[PDB]
A = this chain, B = another copy of it.
């Protein structure tokens, strides 16, 4: 029906998890320089980000069917699950920011 809509420069919105992972990647392979040799590889395959931190292990950040969308598999802090609260990604278990976590775990790996 509504002709007035489809004459706009329309676009489908992004998956809100997709927006974060893309932002995470470039803000991680820019951080893959300030490694001594300690955060060698970042790779976003196809909705799956893999991070290698040889001190801790292999990270897996994952885009997941609901019951809340972003999946953390940390070889240090274990698994966790995140969805939107007020625009940042938040743990279903305790309420901790996803960003805040790999902030610590990366800046510990660089330090140690």
**Any B CB within 8 A of the CB of A68:** yes
Q: Are B93 and A1 in contact (CB under 8 A)?
A: no
Q: Are B79 and A86 in contact (CB under 8 A)?
A: no
**Any B CB within 8 A of the CB of A107:** no
Q: Are A94 and B83 in contact (CB under 8 A)?
A: no
Most chain B beta carbons < 10 A, residue from A58, A65, A85, A93 = A58
Q: Are A45 and B86 in contact (CB under 8 A)?
A: no
Using Cβ atoms and an 8 Å threshold, which residues of chain B touch A67?
A: 15-17, 66, 69, 83-84
Additional A-B contact list (15), CB under 8 Å, known A2-B58, A67-B69, A87-B94? A1-B45, A2-B50, A4-B52, A5-B50, A16-B67, A66-B66, A67-B83, A68-B83, A81-B84, A84-B92, A84-B93, A86-B93, A86-B95, A87-B92, A87-B93
